[PDB]
From Swiss-Prot, chain A:
<comment type="function">
    <text>Component of the 26S proteasome, a multiprotein complex involved in the ATP-dependent degradation of ubiquitinated proteins. This complex plays a key role in the maintenance of protein homeostasis by removing misfolded or damaged proteins, which could impair cellular functions, and by removing proteins whose functions are no longer required. Therefore, the proteasome participates in numerous cellular processes, including cell cycle progression, apoptosis, or DNA damage repair. In the complex, PSMD11 is required for proteasome assembly.</text>
</comment>
<protein>
    <recommendedName>
        <fullName>26S proteasome non-ATPase regulatory subunit 11</fullName>
    </recommendedName>
</protein>
<comment type="similarity">
    <text>Belongs to the proteasome subunit S9 family.</text>
</comment>
<comment type="subunit">
    <text>Component of the 19S proteasome regulatory particle complex. The 26S proteasome consists of a 20S core particle (CP) and two 19S regulatory subunits (RP). The regulatory particle is made of a lid composed of 9 subunits including PSMD11, a base containing 6 ATPases and few additional components.</text>
</comment>
Swiss-Prot record, chain B:
<dbReference type="GO" id="GO:0032039">
    <property type="term" value="C:integrator complex"/>
</dbReference>
<protein>
    <recommendedName>
        <fullName>26S proteasome complex subunit SEM1</fullName>
    </recommendedName>
</protein>
<dbReference type="GO" id="GO:0000724">
    <property type="term" value="P:double-strand break repair via homologous recombination"/>
</dbReference>
<keyword id="KW-0539">Nucleus</keyword>
<keyword id="KW-0647">Proteasome</keyword>
Curated annotation (Swiss-Prot), chain C:
<comment type="subunit">
    <text>Component of the 19S proteasome regulatory particle complex. The 26S proteasome consists of a 20S core particle (CP) and two 19S regulatory subunits (RP). The regulatory particle is made of a lid composed of 9 subunits, a base containing 6 ATPases including PSMC5 and few additional components. Component of a complex with USP49 and RUVBL1. Interacts with PRPF19. Interacts with TRIM5. Interacts with NDC80. Interacts with PAAF1. Interacts, in vitro, with the thyroid hormone receptor (in a thyroid hormone T3-dependent manner) and with retinoid X receptor (RXR). Interacts with ERCC6.</text>
</comment>
<comment type="similarity">
    <text>Belongs to the AAA ATPase family.</text>
</comment>
<comment type="function">
    <text>Component of the 26S proteasome, a multiprotein complex involved in the ATP-dependent degradation of ubiquitinated proteins. This complex plays a key role in the maintenance of protein homeostasis by removing misfolded or damaged proteins, which could impair cellular functions, and by removing proteins whose functions are no longer required. Therefore, the proteasome participates in numerous cellular processes, including cell cycle progression, apoptosis, or DNA damage repair.</text>
</comment>
<protein>
    <recommendedName>
        <fullName>26S proteasome regulatory subunit 8</fullName>
    </recommendedName>
</protein>
UniProtKB/Swiss-Prot annotation, chain D:
<dbReference type="Pfam" id="PF10602">
    <property type="entry name" value="RPN7"/>
</dbReference>
<feature type="domain" description="PCI">
    <location>
        <begin position="182"/>
        <end position="350"/>
    </location>
</feature>
<dbReference type="GO" id="GO:0043161">
    <property type="term" value="P:proteasome-mediated ubiquitin-dependent protein catabolic process"/>
</dbReference>
<protein>
    <recommendedName>
        <fullName>26S proteasome non-ATPase regulatory subunit 6</fullName>
    </recommendedName>
</protein>
<dbReference type="GO" id="GO:1904813">
    <property type="term" value="C:ficolin-1-rich granule lumen"/>
</dbReference>
Amino acid sequence: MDDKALLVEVQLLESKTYHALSNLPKARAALTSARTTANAIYCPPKLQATLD
Amino acid sequence: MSEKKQPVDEDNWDDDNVEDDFSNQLRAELEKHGYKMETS
Amino acid sequence: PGRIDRKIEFPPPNEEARLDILKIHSRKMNLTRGINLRKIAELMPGASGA
Amino acid sequence: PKNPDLRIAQLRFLLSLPEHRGDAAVRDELMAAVRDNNMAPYYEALCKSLDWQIDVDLLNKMKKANEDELKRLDEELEDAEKNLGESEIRDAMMAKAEYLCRIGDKEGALTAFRKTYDKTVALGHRLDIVFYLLRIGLFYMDNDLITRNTEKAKSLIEEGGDWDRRNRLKVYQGLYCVAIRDFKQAAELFLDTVSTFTSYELMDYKTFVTYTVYVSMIALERPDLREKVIKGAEILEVLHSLPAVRQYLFSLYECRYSVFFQSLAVVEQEMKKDWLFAPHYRYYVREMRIHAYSQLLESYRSLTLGYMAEAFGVGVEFIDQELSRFIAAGRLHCKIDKVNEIVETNRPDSKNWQYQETIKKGDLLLNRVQKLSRVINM
């Protein structure tokens, strides 16, 4: 799709549950894809600290 | 080269190493090996 | 043309020619399945080849 | 088809040799056998299971109609249309060959296989036929089929196409588990676990995780077991699902031996419901018990077996009789003792281990040059 701010939520929430299932490198790759997605949004005014 | 002393001469595929050591000692390994605990 | 008899150009390769260059360097590369090099070759609007 | 097909070979075995295990296996096999028009290979099972039932004639006219529907299809095809190779004659005549694995016995299927292998030039379609021989040879455990077509796969085919061979990396060592190679080859090439789609070529995934974790703790104890199965990540996902298997792992690594045997008795009882089963059950438990004894007698040189009366389980005389069988077995390098009641160990040293190896390798080569010096000079 074209909407962007919902992708940063679902990329970060998967990086929780891959880390919750004790898979470290796949949670690394999901977080890195969340970083390069989060570089093109008006404001993550609270989601930045959730990402950080 | 006949030497004139000849005249007579996993299915079990690696069995005899297992069988020479353990033969038939209740191989389900639970009824006494896992069931000592009723004594204590 | 008393000195140099053959002048030979090297234009940037075509889409049919970008496919063949891609097959040489991805030879020892190990691809899984479900992958199309022709789609990737169409993602290069006038690549150099190198 | 052939994609969930290996569950049938489980229910052939699970119904047969334990007759007490005969309640629910017959209930979902015979209904599954009247499904998929399964007609040839169950007459042997119909001798060992329940006696007879006449739906045989009803499915025989069904198996003949589908045979005749495809018979008139490919005879008209081979007599009208004349392009060959991997063409329409090819996939119709393999649909006969797929019919004879799905419904028929092996004999009509194998002669259709060896006919259609001699026709083709695309090695991917050649390797798919070799995929079909390897599966029907895994059904009937034919040891002479599998030695041929694995050599067909390695030598005669796989110098070309790539990363469909990882399907056979699960198979070459799946055949090593049904042999006695439960030791090193099966654990070595089950170690690449990243093929998850529960296909025909990847027959199941969660049981494949249980298979690669049972065989793994015999190849290596601590030449870094912990990196490949404990520090390994994608293996740790699916054993986080299965609670007993992770309990069976961490009892061995974190050295809790009392809960280890409670896990091990469950594993041996769960081992009984396997179809590649004949080398497992006597040999697996006896190897894992002496496996745990070697690391426990390590770090000690003076153990009293009264310390093994409660930090280990129970049964003072039970440890006594099992160590006595193992020391007499030429293994478990220690010396058991009476009324002092102190298990004393002994190990070789630098000098003692390096001399015991050179005394054997020297005599083997000395006997080797006894013969070689006498082959020459008359």
